[PDB]
Design a protein around this ligand. Structure first.
Ligand SMILES: Nc1c(F)c(=O)[nH]c(=O)n1[C@@H]1O[C@H](COP(=O)(O)O)[C@@H](O)[C@H]1O
Ligand SMILES: Nc1c(F)c(=O)[nH]c(=O)n1[C@@H]1O[C@H](COP(=O)(O)O)[C@@H](O)[C@H]1O
Lengths: 322, 327
């Protein structure tokens, strides 16, 4: 209804940040949450159980509402589901007031089989209830007929607001990701432009087309496709993933494509410089420079305060730039 | 000299299967919602002939997920297990295709995108499909086109190679070749795995980055192929009976010729025959290798959307083999 372009602008007005919280729980994170909860009489799960929108998740809600010691003795095959889902709800409850958007990387939800996809669905349901803008980081890429399935999963099933896409196969895939002709629906995506891999220069900088590096060619071809599709008219957009640690490229992209949307991972665990990234990617509509922080929040034992720190420092930097 | 199924590298598993059935047919198993519905409707109209045949097969008892449901009589599913009906018919469609066609398949390739759009249920199907293929000992490829930073991609490695026990997967290395160290190698367990990296794809606008981008006088697709092989060499994959190969579209005749000419011993996986109308004779001619597990020809919809998939697969098997003979 709203369109992601409008959802972001409105939430930005309400919470006055561009922090994007990454929710990428790994096996150790889930184990540690279980062990800690078992040792603290399930303080955090008990807190989760008092929040209203837990009552609106789709999958195995009555399992999620059971007391933890009853899960362990009466529903032991659901133990992992229960603690994984409660870890996610805990992180969301503790940090959401500081988040312009949450980004969930699909890779963390698949490696146990179906169980993590139920968790992923419940996480998207929960964020949708909270009216928090979402990004599914799935880096999808395929031919047209195949990628329609990701469109269905991401935008119909999860009802995500956006996703990440790798357009190296071609730009035309976006016609079957960001647009549903039969339903007249439009969706937003961030395409990979400059990544945080230590060897990202191999293909992104060292390849070129008539004196422009590959990353610029890719960004321009993504914007060309957004144009073709008329996304921005329908309150949607195609934006760019530009690594936090990639200051020169961030500076170039923001200069050359003044009003583009950028999603920037790489601060915290991958050591990117927050002040430099945010300053080089700055826009007064700062929803156009999403600063993603995953592990520096989710692997912090004090995640509310971790998220608050990033929120407060982003605030101070936004003020300096304004 | 003998080893049980599961206890040999993919290079050797492919060679042995090629020596057994003498083809390079890769059957693609990409069931869409229409396929599942049509299977359910056809089985309901014919008293579930194909499902009953699936239920006769020894190895259906060895799959991991919801065997209790899978082994039920089909009329008991429809009447008593309404919430499991889609799982049951989806999984049985996949078993039916595998049962009908496996005798002609050098490998099966499952594209992940078709198994995710209903949420978790298709992932249970996918796991059972891989467990079933593992028991049949037929070489597998998970077409997932994975790409991320090292720390994240480890999770795909676990899903693909531990959970599904796939032989191989597809990878997009645009983000950086070093991701392969965390896909084709597990440093904790000291295990090696195989992959096909995207080199030249079948989408109509594939040239826009793969050919237009260049370094000096080499196009992106050539540079990416070389980088991938340099990594294979670094990781010692072929020593350990694994490999990094290349996805080169059936419709990409010049690039196929370039790749086979400049990398004479590479493994190529080539989709685009059938539904996408690639030229089979040209593809096989240009990509030919006397070890023809090095030129896998993937055919999905032209088999799986045919009402007689056993015969469609046989026809493609025979057609491929006739072209191989005239090479
Ligand atoms: N999608 C990404 C890129 F394109 C990229 O160039 N670099 C990335 O880190 N990510 C993802 O961004 C997140 C980084 O998380 P954190 O380091 O824990 O703060 C992970 O989900 C990464 O997979
Ligand atoms: N992985 C692929 C590529 F890199 C590519 O360049 N072209 C492709 O078609 N596929 C996949 O190959 C299969 C083509 O299937 P069929 O057309 O029904 O015979 C599908 O799974 C496609 O997603």
């Amino acid at each position: 209804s709203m369109g992601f372009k409008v959802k972001l602008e409105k939430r930005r007005n309400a919470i006055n940040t561009c922090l994007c919280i990454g929710l990428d729980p790994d096996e150790k994170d889930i184990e540690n949450f279980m062990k800690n909860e078992k040792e603290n009489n399930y303080n955090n799960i008990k807190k989760n159980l008092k929040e209203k929108y837990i009552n609106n998740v789709s999958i195995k809600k009555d399992i999620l509402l059971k007391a933890p010691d009853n899960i362990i003795r009466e529903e032991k095959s659901e133990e992992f589901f229960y603690f994984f889902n409660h870890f996610c709800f805990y992180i969301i409850n503790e940090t959401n007031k500081y988040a312009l958007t949450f980004k969930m990387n699909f890779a963390f939800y698949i490696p146990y089989g179906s169980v993590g996809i139920d968790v992923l669905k419940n996480v998207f349901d929960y964020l949708y209830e909270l009216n928090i803008p979402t990004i599914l980081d799935m880096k999808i890429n395929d031919i047209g007929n195949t990628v329609k399935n990701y469109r269905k999963f991401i935008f119909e099933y999860l009802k995500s607001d956006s996703c990440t896409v790798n357009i190296y196969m071609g730009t035309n895939m976006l016609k079957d990701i960001c647009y549903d002709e039969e339903k007249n629906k439009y969706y937003s995506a961030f395409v990979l432009v400059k990544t945080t891999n230590p060897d990202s220069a191999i293909f992104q900088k060292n390849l070129s087309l008539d004196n422009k590096q590959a990353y610029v060619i890719m960004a321009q071809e993504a914007l060309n496709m957004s144009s073709y599709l008329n996304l921005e008219q329908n309150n949607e957009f195609i934006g760019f993933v530009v690594g936090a640690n990639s200051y020169d490229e961030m500076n170039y992209i923001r200069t050359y494509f003044p009003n583009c949307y950028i999603l920037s991972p790489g601060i915290g665990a991958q050591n990117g410089d927050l002040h430099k990234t945010l300053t080089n990617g700055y826009h007064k509509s700062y929803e156009k420079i999403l600063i993603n922080i995953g592990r520096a929040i989710t692997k912090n034992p004090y995640p509310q305060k971790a998220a608050q720190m990033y929120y407060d420092q982003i605030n101070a930097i936004l003020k300096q730039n304004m």
